[model samples]
Target: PLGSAMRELLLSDEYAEQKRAVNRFMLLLSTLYSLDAQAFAEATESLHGRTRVYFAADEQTLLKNGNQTKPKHVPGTPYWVITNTNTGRKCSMIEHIMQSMQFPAELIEKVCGTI
Candidate 1:
């Protein structure tokens, strides 16, 4: 059922078009988070749409975003943990503030549908 929902949503005309997204979510994301997605970078866009929807179509897009806790990929032992960035203080609450990032189309259904 979820896979069917995901497939239908991904193939929708709205996600197929970028301008409506620009006018809608872009404006919403910039105002809500105070970032310039248009000229910013993948970093900002990753905050909301774009890549997530791209990922519902493919899985490697499962990576996280943010300034990131660690910056480089070193060689020695190859140790790293992908965690939040900038404010570990707030994220420190961990369970209190824990929310999942990115989503499959079915995940979006729980969010976008239901009214």
Candidate 2:
């Protein structure tokens, strides 16, 4: 399934949204892991859309413990928005309509191995 999912991202435009997901997915891995440099650029190539993550630098301390937490668009956390859903409403946080980006840390666990 991993191989097939990756294939879908590259082989066709049908999974365009998913490709954006992959882009954000690789960004954290590259920054925090720093262990996979070249591979990072190769995989993150498809992020041509508007998806942008303004990453936080202070939490690299947590980098060693990042596996315990999933990425969310908190005000000062790793702020990112692929679309309008990220724009907060008067209520709490506005509900996201498009893809809610979650770290596919499982893929890296599968792609490489357990942390």
Candidate 3:
């Protein structure tokens, strides 16, 4: 699944290196586009429409209700949105960041492993 793959990437050294590159790209993108979270979210909505992002609280929450539209949580820690509303796909923080930036498919595939 996308979530599992994304999680594995997050925990990998490859992502650690890729994250720095992604951050640099983000800085450049923000400067070039005058980007901000609100604008990014708006753009995503415009492209995808009325989609919902789902966050996971922990392994237990994921195990118990991961398949549901909304999963139950356990208050705090290990908080991360694991689902992409646009593609109904699982994703990571890097994926969200890249998507928000409207990054090029080639760059995304190179950095994110999947586009």
Q: What is the TM-score of each candidate against the true structure?
A: 0.20, 0.22, 0.31
Roughly what TM-score does model 1 have, to 2 decimal places? 0.20
Q: What is candidate 2's CA lDDT for residue 84?
A: 24
Enumerate residue pairs that collide in model 2. Answer: none
Among these predictions, the greatest TM-score belongs to: 3
Superposed by TM-score, candidate 2 places the C-alpha of residue 68 at a distance from the truth, in angstroms, of 32
Instruction: Report how far off residue 31 is in candidate 2 (Å).
Output: 3.8
Cα lDDT, model 2, residue 50: 36
What range of 10 consecutive residues in model 1 has the weakest lDDT sum? 90-99
Residues 38-109, model 1: lDDT tens digits: 222332233332222211112223344333233222212222222223232212211111123233444444
Show model 3 residue runs off by greater than 4 Å: 1-35, 46-67, 70-88, 91-100
lDDT tens string, model 3, 55-115?
3335444444434443333212223333323231323434555566666655555544432
TM-score preference between candidates 1 and 3, better one: 3
* Ranked candidates (lDDT, high to low): 3, 2, 1
Ten-residue region with minimum lDDT total, candidate 3: 75-84
